[PDB]
Each structure stands twice: as C-alpha cells, then as structure tokens.
Design a protein around this ligand. Structure first.
Ligand SMILES: CCCCCCCCCCCCCCCCCC(=O)OC[C@H](COP(=O)([O-])OCC(O)COP(=O)([O-])OC[C@@H](COC(=O)CCCCCCCCCCCCCCCCC)OC(=O)CCCCCCCCCCCCCCCCC)OC(=O)CCCCCCCCCCCCCCCCC
Lengths: 69, 36
C-alpha cells in the first residue's frame, strides 16, 4: 500500500542548481581544457642569465606562459 | 463523566471524514508516471 508523500515543490531548486551548474561548466570546461593544453604543449620558462648587451622586455621576467601573456 | 451526545456525534463525523481522507491518500497502481 504505497502512500502519497507530501513535499514542497523541489522543481525550482533543482532547476536553479541545474542552470548554475550548466553555465559554470559551459564557461569552465573550455578554460580547464585550454589550461591543460597550454601547460602540456607550452611549458614554463627556464631561468637563464641575461646575455651580454641585451635588455629583456617587461613581460620576459615571468615563467608561466599565461602570466607572460 | 464521559462523552456527551454532541461530542459523540462530532467525533463520529470527524472520524468518518478523516478515514475517508486517509483512504484518499493512497496511490493508484499507475500514479508515479515517469516522463520519457
Ligand atoms: C560545478 C558545479 C558546482 C559549482 C560550485 C562553485 C564552483 C566555482 C568555480 C569557479 C572557478 C574556479 C576557480 C579556480 C581557478 C584556478 C585555476 C588554477 O590555478 O589551476 C591550478 C592548477 C594549475 O596549475 P598551473 O600553475 O597552471 O601548472 C603549473 C605547471 O606548469 C604544470 O605542470 P605540468 O607541466 O606537469 O602540466 C600538468 C598538466 C598535465 O598533467 C597531466 O596531464 C598528468 C597528470 C596525470 C598523469 C598520471 C598518469 C596517467 C596516465 C598514465 C597511463 C597511460 C600510459 C600507460 C598505459 C599502459 C598501462 C600499463 O595538468 C594541468 O595543467 C592541471 C589542469 C588544470 C585544471 C584546473 C581547472 C581550473 C579551471 C577554472 C574553472 C573550473 C570550473 C569547474 C569545471 C572543471 C572541469 C570539470 O590546476 C590544479 O588544480 C592542479 C591540482 C593538482 C592537485 C592534486 C591533488 C592533491 C591533493 C592533496 C591534498 C589532499 C588532502 C585532501 C584534499 C583533496 C582535494 C583534492
């Protein structure tokens, strides 16, 4: 003998959670994929002494490619 | 020293209504229909 369980409407909370997850993932999955691709294929810079008679650009003092960009 | 006749009648009517409502709370064999 199954009975009816009286509950408050859970449709709207579930819809809000689904929408928030959808938008966050929509904007974040490309970001994570791009970060992973950049890390794998464009590694961090390597420390090196400044060659004689050469001045580096202002963005050539950082090691992460995203930070340099 | 016990239920008065008015109290007896009111309790009987309320009990009948309550039992009818509780019976109505039951589920038909198909009630949880699922969307495709
Ligand atoms: C969702 C709904 C809910 C909503 C809730 C609210 C959410 C709000 C979110 C808002 C936005 C988020 C903000 C965050 C932004 C920050 C981004 C950032 O800075 O990235 C950081 C960081 C990136 O670092 P980096 O500075 O860019 O890289 C520096 C190096 O150059 C790199 O070194 P490398 O050269 O080695 O390269 C490594 C590379 C590649 O490395 C590898 O691939 C190797 C790893 C596996 C190899 C192991 C072997 C496996 C394969 C072998 C088998 C095959 C071969 C053999 C087969 C034959 C078998 C016999 O990997 C990476 O680059 C890391 C990937 C970056 C992903 C970060 C995602 C952030 C994006 C922001 C938005 C996120 C939205 C959420 C959705 C995300 C997607 C679902 O990424 C990480 O998170 C690293 C985490 C590593 C930690 C490991 C876990 C250890 C845990 C220790 C603690 C234990 C205590 C318990 C706690 C447990 C908790 C885990």
């Amino acid at each position: 003998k199954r009975l009816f369980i009286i509950k408050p409407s859970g449709f709207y909370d579930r819809r809000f959670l689904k929408l928030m997850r959808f938008y966050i993932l929509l904007t974040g999955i490309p970001v994570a994929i791009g970060i992973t691709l950049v890390n794998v294929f464009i590694g961090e810079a390597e420390l090196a002494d400044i060659p004689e008679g050469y001045v580096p650009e202002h963005w050539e003092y950082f090691k992460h490619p995203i930070s340099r960009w | 020293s016990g239920y008065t006749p008015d109290e007896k009648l009111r309790l009987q009517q309320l009990r009948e209504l309550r039992r009818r409502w509780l019976k109505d709370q039951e589920l038909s064999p198909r009630e949880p229909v699922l969307p495709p």
